Design a binder for this molecule. Structure first.
Ligand SMILES: Nc1ncnc2c1ncn2[C@@H]1O[C@H](COP(=O)(O)OP(=O)(O)O)[C@@H](O)[C@H]1O
Ligand SMILES: [Cl-]
Ligand SMILES: [Cl-]
Ligand SMILES: [Cl-]
Ligand SMILES: [Cl-]
Ligand SMILES: [Cl-]
Ligand SMILES: [Mg+2]
Length: 165
């Protein structure tokens, strides 16, 4: 089982805290989105655009279940993985760290244009708050550890988690 599975909204720090937490533990980081692009050679988008949700999610769940079983390092879950009941079911029993972030800070951390599909240019703040009302309850449900990242720098978040593992 993974040392920790990180979940949270876009920009809550899944990739960043995941990378730094993994480095600290001397283990590898497995990001489900990446495992998907590598498994299919297709980018996240093409899959969506082409196959769409149901098919992506099915693939994503497939990747998550395998990672939860084979990966012993840090696992960062794609932001929407928790919307699949099969994923929430597979997570039961695992150490799940929910990186919490306010909408104001979250939307500002993602302004990097690093490819945030569900956060188009037109009124991102409004879209981010909607995404939060929708995903937040799910993260809280699967979370075994809730970590507030609002005023904590990445190092402090990492140390906070390490202390509770
Ligand atoms: N605790 C933090 N404090 C300040 N900035 C952060 C923190 N965590 C993440 N960030 C920054 O916010 C941006 C989004 O982080 P990222 O890990 O890619 O988020 P996610 O993978 O959840 O979508 C990155 O530039 C990252 O360095
Ligand atoms: Cl399984
Ligand atoms: Cl590993
Ligand atoms: Cl995300
Ligand atoms: Cl299960
Ligand atoms: Cl600080
Ligand atoms: Mg990420």
């Amino acid at each position: 089982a993974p040392k920790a599975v990180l979940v949270g909204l876009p920009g809550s720090g899944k990739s960043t805290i995941g990378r730094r937490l993994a480095k600290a533990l001397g283990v590898g980081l497995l990001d489900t989105d990446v495992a998907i692009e590598q498994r299919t050679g297709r980018s996240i988008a093409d899959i969506f655009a082409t196959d769409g949700e149901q098919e992506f999610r099915r693939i994503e769940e497939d990747v998550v279940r395998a990672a939860l079983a084979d990966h012993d390092g840090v696992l960062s879950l794609g932001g929407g993985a928790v919307t699949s009941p099969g994923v929430r079911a597979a997570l039961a029993g695992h150490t799940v760290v929910y990186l919490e972030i306010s909408a104001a800070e979250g939307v500002r951390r993602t302004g990097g244009n690093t490819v945030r599909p569900l956060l188009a240019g037109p009124d991102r703040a409004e879209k981010y708050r909607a995404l939060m009302a929708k995903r937040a309850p799910l993260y809280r449900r699967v979370a075994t550890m809730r970590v507030d990242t609002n005023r904590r720098n990445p190092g402090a978040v990492v140390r906070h988690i390490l202390s509770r593992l």
